[PDB]
Design an enzyme around this catalytic site. Structure first.
Site, short mmCIF file in Angstrom:
data_model
loop_
_atom_site.label_atom_id
_atom_site.label_comp_id
_atom_site.label_asym_id
_atom_site.label_seq_id
_atom_site.Cartn_x
_atom_site.Cartn_y
_atom_site.Cartn_z
N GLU A 192 0.70 -1.10 0.24
CA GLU A 192 0.26 0.27 0.23
C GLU A 192 0.97 0.86 0.22
OE1 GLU A 192 -3.95 0.19 1.57
OE2 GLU A 192 -3.98 -0.86 2.93
C1 FAD Z 1 -6.46 -9.44 7.63
C2 FAD Z 1 -5.06 -7.86 7.54
C3 FAD Z 1 -5.05 -7.69 6.61
C4 FAD Z 1 -4.27 -6.18 6.44
N1 FAD Z 1 -4.17 -5.56 4.87
C5 FAD Z 1 -2.75 -5.10 4.80
C6 FAD Z 1 -2.88 -4.79 3.81
O1 FAD Z 1 -2.60 -5.88 3.09
N2 FAD Z 1 -0.77 -4.29 3.62
C7 FAD Z 1 -0.52 -4.11 4.88
O2 FAD Z 1 0.59 -2.95 4.08
N3 FAD Z 1 -0.85 -4.10 5.99
C8 FAD Z 1 -1.76 -4.96 6.30
N4 FAD Z 1 -2.07 -5.51 7.51
C9 FAD Z 1 -0.34 -5.54 8.36
C10 FAD Z 1 0.17 -5.41 8.32
O3 FAD Z 1 -0.07 -7.11 8.34
C11 FAD Z 1 0.77 -5.89 9.73
O4 FAD Z 1 0.89 -4.40 9.95
C12 FAD Z 1 2.46 -5.83 10.03
O5 FAD Z 1 2.54 -7.40 9.26
C13 FAD Z 1 2.37 -6.55 11.62
O6 FAD Z 1 3.64 -6.87 11.67
P1 FAD Z 1 3.93 -6.54 13.60
O7 FAD Z 1 5.66 -7.40 13.20
O8 FAD Z 1 3.98 -5.88 13.79
O9 FAD Z 1 3.50 -7.58 14.07
P2 FAD Z 1 3.12 -9.29 13.91
O10 FAD Z 1 2.91 -10.45 12.40
O11 FAD Z 1 2.28 -9.18 14.70
O12 FAD Z 1 4.16 -10.06 14.69
C14 FAD Z 1 4.32 -10.07 16.52
C15 FAD Z 1 4.25 -11.97 15.86
O13 FAD Z 1 5.04 -12.00 17.52
C16 FAD Z 1 4.42 -12.90 17.93
N5 FAD Z 1 3.89 -13.59 19.63
C17 FAD Z 1 2.69 -12.45 19.56
N6 FAD Z 1 2.44 -13.22 21.44
C18 FAD Z 1 3.50 -13.63 21.75
C19 FAD Z 1 4.11 -13.81 22.59
N7 FAD Z 1 4.09 -13.66 23.95
N8 FAD Z 1 5.31 -14.82 22.38
C20 FAD Z 1 6.24 -14.92 21.46
N9 FAD Z 1 5.75 -14.53 20.58
C21 FAD Z 1 4.39 -13.63 20.02
C22 FAD Z 1 3.35 -13.04 17.31
O14 FAD Z 1 3.02 -14.57 16.67
C23 FAD Z 1 3.80 -12.61 15.67
O15 FAD Z 1 4.30 -13.69 14.58
C24 FAD Z 1 -3.20 -6.28 7.70
C25 FAD Z 1 -3.02 -7.05 8.95
C26 FAD Z 1 -4.38 -8.28 8.67
C27 FAD Z 1 -3.84 -9.06 9.51
#
Ligand code: FAD
Ligand code: NAG
Ligand code: CL
Length: 467
Positions: free
Chosen positions: A61
């Site tokens: 995006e």
């Molecule tokens: C349905 C959906 C649609 C979306 N659409 C878009 C899109 O089209 N384009 C885009 O830019 N963004 C979109 N996003 C947003 C994007 O996917 C997220 O902003 C980004 O991937 C989040 O990454 P993160 O590293 O911040 O969090 P996460 O990907 O959630 O990483 C955190 C990790 O920590 C792990 N975990 C959690 N609790 C613990 C624990 N206590 N112990 C150890 N590990 C833990 C989890 O398993 C996870 O793997 C969307 C999200 C979703 C789910």
């Protein structure tokens, strides 16, 4: 291997991004503890009726603007993931009446242009508000102001247009969303208005895998990450932090010592009881955590024996103007992406997500069928062979899909969300300076967090100043 030791809780995009940046600095004594059995987090593909579709993120995006979206070179050049630009120019031809077919193109175009100008008026207003957020308002309040009404769009066609413009982007109604922080949206301002649908059997998650393999040991034949520093099925439950160091306990009872901990779990996990902090996080940090919104975005996928919907120019996206706001209202068809697949995608958010996640898949399909029959009466529309309802909110490791900036949260208070507490550092899309809610936001947030810590371990600058 030798020097400060950092535990990284979670290996989604931000965790992997952060560990990479730490490694590059020379902080290589990393232990990544991932709760599930894979890396990638909210970038995750699944098998649906013999093809691979995305459960989580699906679009790059913000493409084709004045600045290069860091995720885009990875997707389009490095990995060459199969993708398609989404064209929304024909929505006016594709709005369905609750009972009885499509609205007149001409009629819908006016309503769309009307909504677009209210939003442009909102953009101007936004540009003039003080940086402190003192005079910020909800997207709805701005709408009320321009429309001279006690209410926002309150009419079947107007509401689905409203829903398409805002809910479909932010996963919560304009009523609860901050104007100053979403209109206009730094993602589109900075990286461009275009969005590209990732449709590759490798998965959008390939980006995370690729970044991971830049610094973690992988098997020369297999390709799988074999690095002892990455530990799957490790559910962090307790974090103990002192001025002297940190302790991280996992659900299977293992306890790890470190100099620092990088928490990458979603805002939703932070809002749950999953991870205990001893001592408890300070009030300022706790209020910050509970005041931000972890939204839900449900990508319901359906499989059919035959097709019964339009195809061709401008037919990819279409709307259902229910009298019931946000009821099965945004539809996508995949003639380009999954040709000869017979799959529809309806999206729901917020209140409907939580209702739908709790109900049986059958019942959900029944509702969807009823809607589809109203949209295409006199076509002979077959029951869906198969349904997919992603239940991110129900899942303890996610408790939602992405953060949303709510009204009443100012820039200072958002910065408190990101601020470290002692040796406990925070990362994730919800800590992204201007790109919360996005893949690129998570990616950039790993880098930013990592650098705040590197500036502590190496440079000895440790007091972080909230702003
Ligand atoms: C349905 C959906 C649609 C979306 N659409 C878009 C899109 O089209 N384009 C885009 O830019 N963004 C979109 N996003 C947003 C994007 O996917 C997220 O902003 C980004 O991937 C989040 O990454 P993160 O590293 O911040 O969090 P996460 O990907 O959630 O990483 C955190 C990790 O920590 C792990 N975990 C959690 N609790 C613990 C624990 N206590 N112990 C150890 N590990 C833990 C989890 O398993 C996870 O793997 C969307 C999200 C979703 C789910
Ligand atoms: C993405 O890749 C294609 C094929 O290599 C290239 O021709 C195109 O210009 C790229 N698209 C964008 C938006 O950069
Ligand atoms: Cl009017």
């Amino acid at each position: 291997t030798v020097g400060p030791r950092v535990i990284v809780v979670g290996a989604g995009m931000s965790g992997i991004s952060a560990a990479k940046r730490l490694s590059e600095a020379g902080i290589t004594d990393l232990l990544i503890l991932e709760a599930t059995d894979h890396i990638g987090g909210r970038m995750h593909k699944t098998n649906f009726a013999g093809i691979n579709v995305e459960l989580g993120a699906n679009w790059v995006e913000g493409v084709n603007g004045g600045k290069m979206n860091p995720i885009w070179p990875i997707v389009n050049s490095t990995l060459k993931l199969r993708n398609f630009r989404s064209d929304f120019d024909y929505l006016a031809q594709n709005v369905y009446k609750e009972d009885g077919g499509v609205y007149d193109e001409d009629y819908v175009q006016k309503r769309i242009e009307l909504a677009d100008s209210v939003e442009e008026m909102g953009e101007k207003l936004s540009a003039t508000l003080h940086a402190s957020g003192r005079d910020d308002m909800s997207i709805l309040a701005m709408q009320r102001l321009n429309e001279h009404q006690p209410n926002g769009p309150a009419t079947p066609v107007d509401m689905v247009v409203d829903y398409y413009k805002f809910d479909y982007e932010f996963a919560e109604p304009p009523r609860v969303t901050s104007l100053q922080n979403t209109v206009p949206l730094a993602t589109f301002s900075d990286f461009g208005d275009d969005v590209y649908f990732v449709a590759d059997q490798r998965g959008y998650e390939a980006v995370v895998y690729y970044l991971a393999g830049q610094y973690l040991k992988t098997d020369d034949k297999s390709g799988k990450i074999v690095d002892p520093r990455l530990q799957l099925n490790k559910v962090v439950r307790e974090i103990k932090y002192s001025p002297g160091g940190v302790t991280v306990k996992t659900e299977d009872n293992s306890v790890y010592s470190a100099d620092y901990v990088m928490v990458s779990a979603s805002l939703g996990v932070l809002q749950s009881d999953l991870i205990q902090f001893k001592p408890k996080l300070p009030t300022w940090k706790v209020r910050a955590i509970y005041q931000f919104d972890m939204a839900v975005y449900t990508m319901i996928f359906l499989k059919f024996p035959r097709k019964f919907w339009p195809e061709g120019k401008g037919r990819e996206f279409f709307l259902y103007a229910s009298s019931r706001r946000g009821y099965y209202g945004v539809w996508q068809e995949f003639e380009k992406q999954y040709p000869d697949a017979n799959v529809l995608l309806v999206t729901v958010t917020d209140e409907e997500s939580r209702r739908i996640e709790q109900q049986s898949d059958e019942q959900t399909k029944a509702e969807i069928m009823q809607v589809l029959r109203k949209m295409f009466p006199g076509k002979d529309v077959p029951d869906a062979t198969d349904i997919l309802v992603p239940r991110w909110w129900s899942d303890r490791f996610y408790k939602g899909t992405f953060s949303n900036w709510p009204v009443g949260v100012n820039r200072y208070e958002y910065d408190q969300l990101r601020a470290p507490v002692g040796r406990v550092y925070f990362t994730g899309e919800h800590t992204s300076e201007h790109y919360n809610g996005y893949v690129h936001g998570a990616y950039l947030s790993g880098i930013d967090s990592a650098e705040i810590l590197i500036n502590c371990a190496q440079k000895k600058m440790c007091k972080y100043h909230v702003q």
